[PDB]
Amino acid sequence: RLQESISDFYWYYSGKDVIEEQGKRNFSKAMSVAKQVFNSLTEYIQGPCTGNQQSLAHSRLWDAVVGFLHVFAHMMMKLAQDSSQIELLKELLDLQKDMVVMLLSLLEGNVVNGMIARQMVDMLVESSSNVEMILKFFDMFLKLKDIVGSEAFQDYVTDPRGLISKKDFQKAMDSQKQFTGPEIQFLLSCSEADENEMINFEEFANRFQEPARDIGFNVAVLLTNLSEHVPHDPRLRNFLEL
Amino acid sequence: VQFLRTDDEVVLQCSATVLKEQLKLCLAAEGFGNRLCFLEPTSNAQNVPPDLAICCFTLEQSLSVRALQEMLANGHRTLLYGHAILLRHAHSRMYLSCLTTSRSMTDKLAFDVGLQEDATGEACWWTMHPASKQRSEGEKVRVGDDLILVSVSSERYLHLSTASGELQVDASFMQTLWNMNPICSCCEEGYVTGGHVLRLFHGHMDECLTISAADSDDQRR
Amino acid sequence: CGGERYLDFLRFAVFVNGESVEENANVVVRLLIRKPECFGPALRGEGGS
């Protein structure tokens, strides 16, 4: 029920460019309650309780998981561009971390070709698109922190203070071929639209990395566990390739 | 216990249960030369086979109310209660909609349901509700389950009017249960399926059971 | 006579300061059309004159 309410709030606020402070407060309270709920669930199954694990596997948890992933996939990129929503984005990332932990706990104590593992695979193939968006959002920002050491962009840096013009920074991406054309515009938007075309790639590529490091590591661990415990899974290898 | 999903053909049969017969009539419309829908009886198939070529509706799109409003302002999906759906006639390629004309003089509030050739507007979008007490909103629907459909454009139901002794379907304020029976769901790839048109051929270049030409002495018999 | 009181209370609820409350009006009309028995014998169904 909480997931449905949050999805309705997302669908209402999708059109608006800037989230009102009251909506931010309501989102914060809702995500705090959701974070508390997950922790309780993890506690129920953290100890390898097979009966509780089976009861959760045969439940409506997966639909709520899919809905939460769908909400998250748009929340991250909607709140990234703005500069007044960093706290809300960080709280969202913490909530997403908890979601993964609960899933890992669910995955705790599995066997090869397990029923719970197959259920998780079916969940992933049902919600493939949002997972792909999340994975892309993580990887291009990792490559964003990688671009600081690139000579093909450092030479394009002209400002003595270290600032890089907008057009020059577009050309640098295009030369390095790290990010494709449609992704170029998203990176431009998320960049700190500085008063000059000169932009502080330093902060633009150094932010969103601490809060994303933990959740990215958890996602990698989950994918590795599923890949190792489910042999002969072409969809899973597709996710690994992505 | 299968759940209805998009890209599927349904008959949308309504069980009249008139005179304890349970005819389970189904809506149909030609689409060319006539837009209004009407119920044809699917019962008594042994004595006379009822036509079903004009009784197939494909589930084109499924969406929630809020998302529907947003796109109006602007790959199988499981169908669940409180969701908007789009129905496309198989033969006519048009969309089922709720027309503003009211040919029924018995009820002033009644509205006629028909086919429209455009997907624009909210007149062609419909929402199912959990008519059963056990079911509730937000739950995925399943085959063999009665449903109640309401126009998103105007609150109304596919009421089965029978005041004049003839069963008609119209948008009214009275509730009516509808059975969403799927057909042609299990695609036999490379195999011959029901409700299919084809040219039988003893061998090759045969024209098997090809009727005689027009205005022939055979009378096409 | 029974319906007079409820209709008066409803118009007070909907109308304030010469303007109509959109939310209250929408809720009231939705309930009224959902339950047509509130419209009286006439203006209701096929038998309503």
Q: Does the beta-carbon distance from A12 to B64 stay under 8 Å?
A: no
- Write out the H or E segment, with its range, that includes residue B170: strand B168-172
For an interface test with B, give the residue of A5, A11, A60, A125 to mutate (most B CBs within 10 A): A11
For residue B141, how many other CB atoms are within 10 A of its CB?
19
First to last CA, chain A: 32
Decide if A75 contacts A193 (C-beta within 8 A). no
* Nearest-neighbour CA in chain C from B178: distance (Å): 19
| Short-list B30, B147, B5, B39, CA closest to B89 | B30
Q: Which chains touch C (3 or more CB pairs under 8 A)?
A: B
Give the list of residues 6+ apart from residue C34 with CB closer than 8 angstroms, or none: B155, B173
Q: What's the CA gap between B188 and B11, in Å, rounded? A: 19
Q: What span, in angstroms and rounded, lies between the C-alpha atoms of C9 and C21?
A: 14
The resolution, in angstroms to one decimal, equals: 3.2
Interface residue A4 vs chain B (CB under 8 A): yes
At residue B105, φ and ψ (nearest 5 deg) are: -80, -10
3-state secondary structure of B130: coil
Going by C-alpha positions, the residue among B138, B108, B130, B137 that lies closest to residue B175 is B130
Closest CA to B11 of B130, B114, B144, B131: B144
Beta bridge partner(s), residue B126: B85, B151
Is the torsion defined by CA of B212, B216, B217, B220 positive or negative?
A: positive
Residues of B with a Cβ under 8 Å from any C Cβ are 106-109, 155, 163, 173-174
CB contact under 8 A, A11 and B73: no
Query: Do the Cβ atoms of C46 and B163 come within 8 Å?
Result: yes
Residue of C nearest to B109 (CA): C45
DSSP state of B211: P
For A26, the token pair is 């309501």
Whole-angstrom distance, CA of residue B54 vs CA of residue B27: 9
Expressed in angstroms, the distance from the first to the final Cα of chain B is 45
CB pairs under 8 A between A and B: 10
Backbone angles phi, psi at B67, to 5 degrees: -65, -40
Q: How many CA atoms lie within 13 A of B3 on its CB side?
A: 10
Kindly state the helix (H) or strand (E) to which residue C34 belongs, with its residue range.
Answer: helix C22-34
The whole-angstrom separation of Cα B87 and Cα B83 is 13
Contact A106, A121 (CB under 8 A): no
- The amino acid occupying position A193 is A
Beta bridge partners of A18: none
C46 neighbourhood in chain B, CB within 8 Å = 106-107, 163
A228 is in an annotated binding site: no
Letter for the amino acid at B111? F
**A12 interfaces chain B, CB cutoff of 8 Å:** yes
Given its phi and psi angles, is residue B195 left (phi above 0), alpha (psi -120 to 50 degrees) or beta? Answer: left
At residue B129, the 3 state secondary structure works out as strand
CA distances from A152 to A51, A188, A204 (A): 57, 18, 18
Structure tokens at B159: 């009421």
Yes or no: say if B36 and B168 are a contact pair by the CB < 8 Å rule.
no
List the alpha helices (DSSP H) in chain A.
2-13, 21-46, 50-57, 61-81, 86-107, 115-126, 128-146, 151-154, 166-176, 181-190, 201-206, 210-229, 234-241
Query: Does A15 sit within 8 Å of B66, measured CB to CB?
Result: no
